[PDB]
Amino acid sequence: QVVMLYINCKVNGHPVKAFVDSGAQMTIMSQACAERCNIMRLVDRRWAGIAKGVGTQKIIGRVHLAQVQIEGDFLPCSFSILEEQPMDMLLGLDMLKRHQCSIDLKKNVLVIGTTGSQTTFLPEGELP
Amino acid sequence: GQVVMLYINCKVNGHPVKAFVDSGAQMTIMSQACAERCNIMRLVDRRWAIIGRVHLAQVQIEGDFLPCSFSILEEQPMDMLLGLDMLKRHQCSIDLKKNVLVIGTTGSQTTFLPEGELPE
Numbered sequence: 287q288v289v290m291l292y293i294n295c296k297v298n299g300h301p302v303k304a305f306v307d308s309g310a311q312m313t314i315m316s317q318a319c320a321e322r323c324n325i326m327r328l329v330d331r332r333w334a335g336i337a338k339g340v341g342t343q344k345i346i347g348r349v350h351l352a353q354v355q356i357e358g359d360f361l362p363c364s365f366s367i368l369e370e371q372p373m374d375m376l377l378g379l380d381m382l383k384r385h386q387c388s389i390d391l392k393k394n395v396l397v398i399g400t401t402g403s404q405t406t407f408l409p410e411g412e413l414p
Numbered sequence: 415g416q417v418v419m420l421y422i423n424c425k426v427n428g429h430p431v432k433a434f435v436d437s438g439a440q441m442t443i444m445s446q447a448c449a450e451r452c453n454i455m456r457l458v459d460r461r462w463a464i465i466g467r468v469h470l471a472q473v474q475i476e477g478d479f480l481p482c483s484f485s486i487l488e489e490q491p492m493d494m495l496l497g498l499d500m501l502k503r504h505q506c507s508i509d510l511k512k513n514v515l516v517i518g519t520t521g522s523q524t525t526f527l528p529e530g531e532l533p534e
């Protein structure tokens with residue numbers, strides 16, 4: 287009964303619950319979430335089918351740059367779009383390292399290294 | 415466009431283990447080969463199963479012996495996957511600014527391994 291790591295963020299003003307996965311090489315957004323956040327126009331479909339990790343769904347394309355809002359911070363991020371994914375957004379080591387983040391399980395916060403801004407991990411009742 | 419995954423040096427029963435640090439993994443897992451190499455098969459409760467479960471073994475990081483619990487996978491490529499269960503139990507921080515795993519129960523810290531020092 288260990289609660290997995292989620293944070294609240296926003297893309298293009300739209301609320302997103304992001305799964306925090308230090309063992310994932312690539313950050314991934316679901317197509318459903320890219321559509322909901324109105325960022326399909328950013329999806330470079332020339333990256334269709336490029337994936338670093340094994341899975342069960344096709345990669346649709348690659349967002350080279352979109353701002354992921356965490357608290358007051360707008361973080362420039364790169365990520366690929368999976369046709370389907372259990373969670374809307376998987377925050378992987380690529381972006382965790384890009385922003386020099388700290389996954390602090392004592393305080394139960396994700397720290398954004400750049401700015402020292404912090405956002406709390408979600409309690410079990412707020413998990414998708 | 416080429417991300418170095420997070421490993422740490424640790425020791426189990428005196429044997430060096432390079433542990434993959436995975437905040438998205440619900441459970442800590444050691445390969446059967448590694449359990450054998452570390453001479454801790456005696457501690458593998460086979461009623462679980464995934465070959466079994468080690469209920470309590472010391473995992474050494476730097477100078478600390480941390481009680482961990484983990485399951486044993488018949489083949490895992492990697493010797494050891496340090497999951498959220500153990501990262502939470504030891505109130506760790508994965509500090510990617512400093513590039514260290516902080517052990518919250520002791521204040522110790524250990525560096526993530528450079529690319530040249532990774533397994534496989």
Ligand SMILES: [Cl-]
Binds near residue numbers: 349364365
């Ligand atoms: Cl890119």
Ligand SMILES: [Cl-]
Binds near residue numbers: 429430451
């Ligand atoms: Cl050995």
